[PDB]
């Protein structure tokens, strides 16, 4: 046990040993970006691949070319924290070495006249952080992986649902990574048609003719030949034995049945058959037959032989005739009938027809047609069947060559045609479109490489255009390359792509789940409305690869998936999952990662299979799965086993205790809502857990993990200094490690990110130990919510539907109080009238509102502010304003007139009260820094001095020097002092950060981990809540009616186990309080940890006295227990745990009504549930408006709480009002509340006068409609 785990050991109720630990959860991001940016000597991945794909750039004439040498990434201007503060992208400069080689015209082509080698700046590449995130414009973002259709060839059918009859129509689609699409389809007349890029169909034979295939060659490729001879004045079939098995058969020695088995007579073996001429009459010729004497073609290819034709060849002396084999079951004339409907007879005609279908309305020339056909599929510039696409193509058509080819050829097209014809005949099957072997994962590295190659092509066009000019004596490579297109491409992808998403940052689990998210949408994917049922379904290949539970509930159902716990992407982008080998009947601890294609062959047992001490299966027939179908299989036929019991579910589903007792519809909700939990003031571990909490806490990156072991030299709320062990020093190293903690930093969802130390000075630490706990972490365990005392009973209708009744104590102990940090900005710009000024001289505002402001007009740090309070004072110059005559008279009476400037200041939003915790001032380079900005600059300089001095002192104390530290401090000073690159016209920016403490209140959303969500209805007094015989009231009362119809029984089991765990914790607390002997404490702890037949062997004898005391202290608030998914605690274990803690075995206590003192007539299930506070707070959702801003064109109220907008009275509301008959209410809604400009002012004045009458007019939207219809040249008018 590690020290952090030794501090609080969680009891494990699992029974199956784990042979494979859960791998790093953020590998799918880090590995992809490493592939992108790392240098590849083989040049197959990333920037090197893109550069070698575009370069060398060759001029059209041949004068010169630009060649690629190498690339490197420079040093970032700012770090991640500095980029987030300033609002800039964290990135590295791309520097590429290129040589412009200029050839000699007089010399033969290829003579190196000159070379010019130089480094070129080719843009700025955004960098991935240590946790798999990007910082774009100061915002943390995650690029989501895509599940797309693999490149290659796919054979499909319409399933007999297009034509009037069944007639199942078959098609084959070739889809590349880049380039046009190729389609081969059957019509209901059994003819083969070709489509290029989804346009008008053409007969398939055309594509063969453009490839130089004669009609006879086509027939030879697509048909077998039955031959005929004239032997001794008799007709001659060449017999193929397999075909025969309506006429009299030859071979008089072995006569077969005549006009009425085959194998017995074929056993002897003859090569001679005699047949009627009528057998020839129906056949179709296979060759073109010419006569030298006549000079004409007696019979053409693909022509039906006739009697006169037979006579003509008889006179011509030809004795052998071959025709095509054609049947109705195994062989078909489809290619012959296609040739019949084909009007093309030569390569040029086919090229011309392809040009007409490509580019209609253009005069076809031979050269243009040839160039078009070459560019469509056989040009590497415009076609790319990628390596994955090539491998899938070759596997489909059974080709074992051209592994590195990226373009189609004759063999590929002909093999696709043959396979489609074969599928029509009956040999072969169509492809499963939703099979995970046909769907590929495309991650950040691939998409970045694609966009970077796009930028490279953009600049390559201009480079070729310039090199074609010729005047290159004074041209250097950096004068040829414009990096702005490449930068535009990369910023487009990283900031405006659909898959570049604003990071989910409510809790660590939200971040981990977001980084492990796979979308079917995005560029090159599906669309929400156009996606069908089949793609949204759970395929049998999702086992161990995609979680069947975690998926968004809504229009996105089935299109967004979560990676499973052990899922991985192979080198080709296909998901694979680990399995344990079964060798010689024993289950080996060797692991093989199998993909969907490889999985189908084998018989794979489940992790629940019983095992013997020798490693083999106990039962003779085991439950396994093969080809996606489950069943019972012999023990000797099992080839693989599942590595873990949580292999099929994702991390969020793996965090749900007793998941096997929950219906999947509710497990979906539980997994989704675990990601919306808001961290609280005090993180509390779950009493009932699954064991994956530590993994999420460590792999999220929110915690501070010891890079090296040692002894904690110094601990503080903001800094941890570790004295490293003597065995783990880099020779000549200071010997200390410094961990600076994040303290009250805003997250993407305006929550609080705070790191709290969990170590003491002098405490030994090993590698991987948790030194500080991030948000929603407790001693290295994920702590999303709080443990609540729960009673399942109705309480006077306050838990009606899904309502939740909460005790006042829960509010008093601040158990669900949350900190929300909000950022506000005041931007002083430059206007035509003048420059906006930030100052405390605010007109028409007294000294009451200026108390919290300083001389510079900015609020003090630590100022408690309420709604409407001024944070930053700002005055905007205003123009001359016309005064009404009454205002002129009022000014004449009282002469005051001070209206030079207008108060446009930053104020706290209404219903927001908090504390100012940070103020930042950004000033444009060349604008005077006010007193406050100078104060912040001095404070930052002093803090940098102090931090550098302390760090230097500790590192020199560990070691036991001026130029290097002076350089570091000079760099820090330059970063602090310099001006800020702000948006044009912006003179100054002041950002104020407000910390708001939000307490639980009616309207807040609370949930468990089983889909049991609800809204708080009442905050009950403690004396009114149900209580037990010992006087302890419950904390939350939940409705028992929500359990049976929703089939989430894991919540009841969790309640029972939580009651047991809290009882055992109370027993431990009692033993500590009475100061019993440590031997008794050890005996009790060992009894607790030995309960059940579990896989955990915790020996308290190996723990020191201080360790036992620490463990007992950490078990005071309840014993944490682990119940893994599908390997959980049985009911017998729960009852034994209840009996140990001296609690009823049924989990039901006798409760009394606090209002009356009377016992409830039945026992009530009382226990402890882990409850969460979701980020759906009534503070952010309560809106109201009477009158406000209006739209510019429609003159209707704006929309949104941010704009103080109004609710939309849609069509269905109008229908409801019409059904009621409320004509006057409807007219109010249409006219005087939305867009009757005169009517709404009159209505406001009437209400102020207390008259309550309206004078409706014409809505402005109708006037707009009239104007647009008139603008369409249509006279629309109103008649009286």
């Amino acid at each position: 046990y590690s020290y952090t785990e030794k501090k609080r050991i969680r009891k494990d109720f699992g029974t199956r040993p784990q042979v494979l630990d859960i791998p790093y959860l953020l590998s799918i991001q880090l590995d992809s970006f490493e592939k992108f940016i790392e240098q590849d000597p083989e040049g197959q991945y990333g920037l090197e691949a893109a550069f070698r794909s575009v370069f060398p750039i060759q001029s059209y004439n041949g004068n010169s070319e630009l060649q690629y040498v190498s690339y490197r990434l420079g040093e970032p201007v700012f770090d991640v924290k500095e980029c987030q503060i300033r609002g800039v992208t964290y990135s590295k400069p791309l520097r590429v070495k290129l040589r412009l080689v200029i050839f000699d015209k007089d010399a033969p082509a290829g003579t190196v006249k000159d070379i010019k080698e130089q480094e070129v700046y080719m843009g700025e590449i955004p960098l991935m952080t240590e946790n798999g995130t990007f910082v774009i414009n100061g915002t943390e973002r995650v690029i989501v992986s895509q599940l797309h259709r693999s490149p290659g060839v796919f054979f499909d059918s319409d399933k007999g649902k297009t034509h009037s009859s069944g007639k199942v129509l078959y098609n084959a689609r070739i889809i590349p990574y880049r380039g046009s699409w190729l389609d081969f389809e059957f019509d209901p007349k059994d003819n083969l048609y070709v489509r290029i890029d989804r346009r008008r169909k053409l007969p398939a034979s055309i594509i063969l003719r453009v490839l130089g295939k004669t009609s006879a060659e086509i027939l030879d490729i697509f048909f077998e030949k039955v031959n005929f001879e004239v032997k001794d004045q008799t007709l001659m079939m060449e017999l193929v034995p397999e075909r025969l098995r309506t006429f009299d058969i030859e071979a008089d020695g072995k006569v077969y049945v005549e006009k009425g088995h085959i194998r017995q007579l074929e056993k002897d073996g003859v090569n001679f058959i005699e047949v009627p001429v009528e057998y020839i009459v129906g056949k179709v010729s296979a060759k073109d037959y010419v006569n030298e004497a006549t000079g004409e073609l007696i019979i053409t290819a693909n022509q039906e032989i006739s009697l006169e034709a037979l006579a003509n060849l008889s006179q011509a002396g030809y004795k052998k005739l071959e025709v095509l084999f054609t049947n109705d079951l195994d062989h078909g004339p489809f290619m012959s009938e296609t040739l019949r409907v084909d009007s093309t007879t030569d390569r040029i005609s086919a090229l011309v027809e392809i040009y007409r279908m490509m580019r209609p309305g253009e005069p076809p020339t031979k050269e243009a047609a040839e160039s078009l056909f070459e560019s469509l599929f056989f040009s590497a510039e415009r076609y790319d069947l990628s390596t994955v696409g090539r491998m899938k193509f070759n596997s489909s058509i059974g080709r074992e060559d051209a592994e590195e080819q990226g373009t189609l050829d004759e063999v590929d097209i002909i093999e696709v045609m043959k396979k489609l014809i074969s599928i029509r005949n009956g040999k072969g099957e169509v492809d499963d479109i939703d099979h995970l072997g046909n769907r590929r994962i495309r991650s950040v590295g691939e998409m970045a490489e694609n966009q970077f190659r796009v930028g490279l092509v953009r600049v390559e066009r201009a480079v070729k255009e310039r090199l074609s000019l010729g005047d290159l004596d004074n041209v250097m490579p950096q004068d040829l390359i414009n990096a702005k297109p490449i930068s535009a491409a990369v910023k487009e992808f990283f900031g405006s792509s659909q898959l570049s998403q604003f990071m989910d940052q409510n809790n660590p689990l939200s971040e981990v789940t977001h980084k492990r998210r796979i979308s079917a949408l995005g560029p090159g994917g599906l669309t929400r409305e156009r996606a069908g049922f089949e793609v949204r379904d759970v395929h049998v290949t999702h086992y161990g690869r995609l979680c069947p539970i975690e998926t968004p509930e809504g229009p996105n159902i089935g299109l967004i998936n979560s990676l499973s716990a052990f899922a991985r992407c192979n080198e080709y982008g296909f998901l694979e999952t680990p399995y344990r080998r079964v060798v010689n009947g024993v289950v080996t601890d060797e692991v093989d990662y199998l993909s969907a294609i490889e999985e189908g062959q084998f018989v794979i047992a489940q992790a629940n299979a019983k095992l013997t001490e020798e490693g083999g299966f106990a039962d003779e027939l085991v439950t396994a799965r093969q080809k996606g179908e489950s069943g019972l299989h012999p023990r000797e036929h099992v080839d693989y086993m599942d590595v873990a019991t949580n292999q099929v579910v994702s991390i969020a589903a793996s965090l749900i205790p007793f998941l096997e007792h929950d219906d999947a519809n509710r497990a979906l909700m539980g997994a989704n809502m675990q990601r919306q939990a808001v961290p609280t003031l005090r993180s509390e571990k779950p009493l009932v857990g699954t064991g994956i909490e530590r993994n999420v806490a460590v792999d999220s990156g929110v915690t501070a993990v010891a890079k090296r072991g040692g002894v904690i030299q110094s601990v503080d709320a903001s800094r941890i200094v570790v004295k490293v062990n003597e065995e783990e020093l880099i020779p000549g190293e200071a010997g200390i490690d410094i961990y600076n903690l994040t303290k009250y930093t805003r997250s993407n969802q305006n929550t609080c990110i705070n790191q709290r130390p969990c170590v003491m000075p002098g405490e030994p630490v090993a590698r991987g130990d948790v030194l500080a706990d991030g948000p929603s972490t407790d001693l290295g365990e994920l702590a999303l919510g709080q443990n609540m005392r729960i009673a399942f009973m109705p309480w006077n209708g306050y838990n009606f539907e899904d309502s939740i009744l909460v005790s006042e104590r829960v509010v008093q102990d601040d158990r669900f109080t949350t900190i929300h940090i909000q950022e506000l900005s005041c931007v002083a710009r430059d206007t035509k009238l003048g420059a906006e000024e930030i100052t405390a001289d605010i007109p028409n505002v007294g000294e009451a509102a200026l108390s919290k402001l300083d001389e510079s007009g900015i609020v003090y740090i630590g100022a408690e502010v309420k709604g409407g309070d001024i944070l930053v004072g700002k005055v905007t110059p205003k123009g001359e304003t016309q005064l009404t005559p009454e205002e002129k008279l009022l000014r004449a009476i009282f002469g005051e007139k001070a209206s030079d400037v207008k108060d446009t200041s930053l104020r706290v939003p209404n219903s927001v009260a908090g504390t100012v915790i940070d103020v930042q001032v950004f000033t444009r380079d060349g604008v005077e820094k006010d007193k406050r900005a100078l104060e912040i600059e001095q404070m930052q300089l002093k803090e940098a001095k102090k931090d550098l001095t302390e760090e230097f002192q500790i590192l020199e104390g560990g070691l036991l020097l001026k130029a290097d530290f002076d350089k570091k401090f000079e760099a820090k000073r330059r970063k602090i002092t310099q001006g800020d690159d702000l948006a044009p016209g912006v003179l100054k920016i002041v950002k104020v950060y407000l910390a708001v403490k939000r307490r639980i209140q009616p309207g807040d959303k609370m949930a468990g981990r089983h889909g049991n969500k609800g809204v708080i209805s009442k905050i009950n007094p403690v004396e009114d809540m149900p209580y037990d015989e010992n006087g302890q009231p419950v904390d939350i009362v939940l409705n028992p009616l929500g359990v049976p119809s929703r089939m989430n029984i894991g919540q009841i089991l969790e309640v029972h186990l939580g009651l047991a765990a809290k009882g055992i914790g109370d027993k431990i607390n009692q033993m500590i309080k009475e100061q019993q002997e440590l031997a008794k404490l050890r005996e009790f702890l060992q009894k607790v940890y030995d309960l059940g037949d579990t896989r955990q062997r915790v020996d308290i004898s190996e723990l020191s006295d201080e360790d036992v005391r620490t463990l007992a202290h950490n078990l005071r608030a309840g014993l944490p227990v682990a119940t893994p998914v599908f390997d959980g605690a049985p009911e017998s274990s729960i009852k034994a745990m209840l009996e140990l803690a001296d609690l009823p075995a049924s989990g039901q206590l006798t409760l009394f009504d606090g209002r009356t003192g009377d016992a409830f007539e039945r026992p009530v299930t009382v226990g402890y549930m882990y409850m969460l506070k979701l980020n759906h707070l009534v503070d952010d959702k309560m809106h109201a408006r009477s009158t406000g801003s209006y739209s510019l064109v429609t003159q209707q109220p704006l929309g949104g709480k941010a704009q103080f907008g109004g609710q939309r009275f849609g069509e269905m509301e109008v229908w409801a009002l019409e059904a009621y008959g409320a004509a006057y209410t409807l007219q109010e809604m249409l006219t005087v509340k939305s867009d009757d400009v005169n009517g709404r002012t009159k209505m406001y004045k009437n209400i102020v006068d207390g008259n309550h009458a309206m004078e409706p007019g014409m809505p402005e939207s109708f006037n707009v409609l009239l104007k647009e219809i008139r603008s369409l040249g249509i006279n629309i008018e109103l008649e009286d």
């Binding site: 580019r359 209609p360 309305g361 253009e362």
Partner: peptide, 10 residues
Amino acid sequence: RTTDPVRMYM
């Protein structure tokens, strides 16, 4: 056969 004015102009 075509609607693009560019192609008609060419």
